[PDB]
Design a protein around this ligand. Sequence first.
Ligand SMILES: Cc1cc2nc3c(=O)[nH]c(=O)nc-3n(C[C@H](O)[C@H](O)[C@H](O)COP(=O)(O)O)c2cc1C
Length: 476
Amino acid sequence: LTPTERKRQGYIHELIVTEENYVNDLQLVTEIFQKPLMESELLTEKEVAMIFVNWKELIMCNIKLLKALRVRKKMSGELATTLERIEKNFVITDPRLPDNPIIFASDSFLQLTEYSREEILGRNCRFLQGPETDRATVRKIRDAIDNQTEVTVQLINYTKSGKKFWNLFHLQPMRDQKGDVQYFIGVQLDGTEHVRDAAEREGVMLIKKTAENIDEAAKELKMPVKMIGDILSAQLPHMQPYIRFCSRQLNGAALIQQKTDEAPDFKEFVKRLAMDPRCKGMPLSSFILKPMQRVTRYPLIIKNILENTPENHPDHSHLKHALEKAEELCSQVNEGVREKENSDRLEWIQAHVQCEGLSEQLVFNSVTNCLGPRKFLHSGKLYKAKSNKELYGFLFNDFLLLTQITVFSPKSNLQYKMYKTPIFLNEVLVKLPPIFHISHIDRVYTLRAESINERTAWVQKIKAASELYIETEKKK
Ligand SMILES: Cc1cc2nc3c(=O)[nH]c(=O)nc-3n(C[C@H](O)[C@H](O)[C@H](O)COP(=O)(O)O)c2cc1C
């Protein structure tokens, strides 16, 4: 096959495999960090929500994505578990991708070579080679690769610390029905001495049977993919919860670091949850960075698929939209991260303003219907005319929230109760007769601000955000 179509399948499966690892990481934090901390009674229900935030919703998004990928790929969840049951040193590489990168490494392999998964994936296997390695043996391996055939040799490899060990290595291509090589299987039998006669004859049989089991394990993965963009184009516009999480990931990380230094009983309980072999010895504070990494990873991946997809291909159109949505999703994420002050205010409103009786729960620190990331504009006391009722209003870029006190200082806590249904600014007009008039089509509202300088701040900000909303709605 042409290198273009070859690279195309390589990047399509780069999307699928990395998503598998990612979704797996999300479920880990919920399993061995979230649920334990909630039932540990070490922290309050409020402190826990500051860290994970909407972590649960992040899983619901990607699981919906991963499932769609698996059905198209005719896969099942078994791949990770099936591969883990093979307790041998092995890696899988992708010859379709430049420099033949590693896409998977067994637990035995990682511990043998003293490297971590983050150091390994995406790189060529030549880091094992050293000074006392027979370069003639290496060339035989390269030839077997270029000729797309299996091979079995012995050579000296090095760990991360530089420890020497003999490597009874076996290479084996992974072919589909059409015989096209999709992956390469590399099994390593570590030893102290060069094996001969019976010692060699036994080791060869094991590492070869090991390779066959991997081919069976990766049987669902090896098949080629026709289309993948239509799935990404339908799932990416539903990656909204990332905007909230990534805007609060900084405060969530600062909470962990602070609570650790002021509570020794908390520090030990966290590390006893990072013990789990699925954590690979990385702390909880390192998992929090992953959602921000994944959303910035998507545009890089999709573009690689798009660049290796011709114009006449039916998947080219969907990949265009997918790239657009991925970049739009990524942009709104970076906007929320930068506007830190706006993020603190929206989350403050979330906790102190009780909004109930709605068809859907109100999340202030989220995306609007049309304008994107919600932005707080103005707040203050508002007195309704002819009633003079003490009300407290919150003005946003998309709607106005009226409440009643039962301002943004974290220590100061006071309760706000929702007064009426959120008045959206896509259907309101504002004129002047500290009294100002807003014109809703259905009902009439006449409010009186604290002062003259206040009502001018209301009228201006409401009108400006309204006109921006109206003209945005007129686009389509
Ligand atoms: C699946 C696979 C597994 C490999 N495993 C090893 C290995 O364990 N040790 C090693 O020295 N080379 C291994 N190689 C070979 C190297 O990745 C590399 O291709 C080889 O050393 C030739 O390097 P060169 O391109 O600089 O000539 C493996 C290759 C493949 C495709």
